[PDB]
Design a protein around this ligand. Structure first.
Ligand SMILES: Nc1nc2c(ncn2[C@@H]2O[C@H](COP(=O)(O)OP(=O)(O)O)[C@@H](O)[C@H]2O)c(=O)[nH]1
Ligand SMILES: [Mg+2]
Length: 170
């Protein structure tokens, strides 16, 4: 058998939940104080839709100019999660920056990605509606998913699996 690696890159503004989502996925715990500047990668064999793969995931953090790993992951990544927080309108607006960046680096008209609206467990603080998120995803022609990394987590496994599905379906 030829077991593929899917290199997945988690991008988005600071504070949106990239680390919490990634740690929830790999460790099944909610970490609420993960250093905003620390970048980690994760590697594991896992089975998605009854097909084995290796996932190599970068949880991006801090400045690109100080990152050892960023350049290679951006250039060679197979898919991207673009994460915003529904409580941070600027983070939602900035999705367009990440969308443009990915298409520029990958040098293609489209590329595997999912729009991830995180922190949907929060009601009072929510500033970006579901419909605003879904319309943005429609504009980019990419999937839209709502998540919460807080216990009990919502759609965390599904988000990573769905990105693999997009890669497989392209
Ligand atoms: N309520 C809630 N808080 C979250 C969620 N995801 C992350 N957080 C919190 O938001 C803050 C930033 O999360 P973090 O994962 O470090 O963001 P990052 O900078 O994108 O890596 C932390 O205090 C987390 O506990 C979520 O789904 N719901
Ligand atoms: Mg982080």
């Amino acid at each position: 058998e030829n077991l593929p690696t899917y290199k997945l890159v988690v991008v988005g503004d600071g504070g949106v939940g990239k680390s919490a989502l990634t740690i929830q996925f790999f460790q099944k715990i909610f970490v609420d104080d993960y250093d905003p500047t620390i970048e980690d990668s994760y590697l594991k064999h896992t089975e998605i839709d009854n097909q084995w793969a290796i996932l190599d995931v970068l949880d991006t953090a801090g400045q690109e100019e100080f990152s050892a790993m960023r350049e290679q992951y951006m250039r060679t990544g197979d898919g991207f999660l673009i994460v915003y927080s529904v409580t941070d309108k600027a983070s939602f607006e900035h999705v367009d920056r990440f969308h443009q960046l990915i298409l520029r680096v990958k040098d293609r008209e489209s590329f595997p990605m999912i729009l991830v609206a995180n922190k949907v467990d929060l009601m009072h603080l929510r500033k970006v509606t579901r419909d605003q998120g879904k319309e943005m995803a429609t504009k980019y022609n990419i999937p839209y998913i709502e998540t919460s990394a807080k216990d009990p987590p919502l759609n965390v496994d599904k988000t990573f699996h769905d990105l693999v599905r997009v890669i497989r379906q392209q």
